[PDB]
Structure 1
Amino acid sequence: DIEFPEWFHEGLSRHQAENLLMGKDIGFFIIRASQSSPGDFSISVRHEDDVQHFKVMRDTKGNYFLWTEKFPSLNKLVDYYRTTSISKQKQVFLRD
């Protein structure tokens, strides 16, 4: 039962992610393997006038986090940022 989520595109560049999400509404997002740091992952998210990018942080027990709160999986991280703003500078909430 392994298929990736419809918004997880492993190979998509930063620039391709910005072009895509400019054609979607605020909060729409994708996850990609990081281009500037091999082995990282990135969430690109449509904000009001532009697309901003967040680095997926990990610890040794394998949690995922972006800011403070920690999650056992990428999907649980996603789901939590559906109702807590992923941006600390404006109000922005993951939506699909």
Structure 2
Amino acid sequence: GSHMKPHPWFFGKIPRAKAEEMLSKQRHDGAFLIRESESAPGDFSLSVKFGNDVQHFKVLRDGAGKYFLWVVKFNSLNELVDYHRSTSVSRNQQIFLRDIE
């Protein structure tokens, strides 16, 4: 059956510096991870590799508690992540999220 495994993209609390340090070593654009921001408690950040840069997206929450980056809302970080596997996380370029390797 569909193997029940933890998600390899949740790195918990790690500095923005170590995530950039780790993701710059990734082979493919879209390589990403969700981290718990240390700039403010309970906030999450999405770090994605693109070219020789690592882009950081802040995960926002609305009045009902849903998550979002731009306009579409998600009931979980899990659905937000999967959504951006097939729809770009970026406004300026097409960047699709893909698992680290």
TM-score using structure 1 length? 0.91
Are 1:38 and 2:41 an aligned pair?
yes
CA distance in 2, matches of 1:42, 1:49: 19
Higher RCO, Cα 8 Å, sep 6+: 2
Query: Residue 15 of structure 2 aligns with which residue?
Result: 13
- Gap change, CA 1:59 and 1:4, over 3 Å in 2: farther
Counterpart in 2 of 1:72?
75
Structure 2 residue runs of 5 or longer lacking an equivalent are none
Q: Which has the larger radius of gyration?
A: 2
**CA–CA distance in structure 1, aligned partners of residues 41 and 60 of structure 2:** 13
RMSD across aligned positions (CA): 1.3
Instruction: Give matches, 1:16-31, under 5 Å.
Output: 16-24=18-26, 25-31=28-34
Unmatched 5+ residue regions in structure 1? none
1:37 deviation in Å? 2.1
Q: TM-score, normalised by structure 2?
A: 0.87
Question: Matched residue pairs, number?
Answer: 94
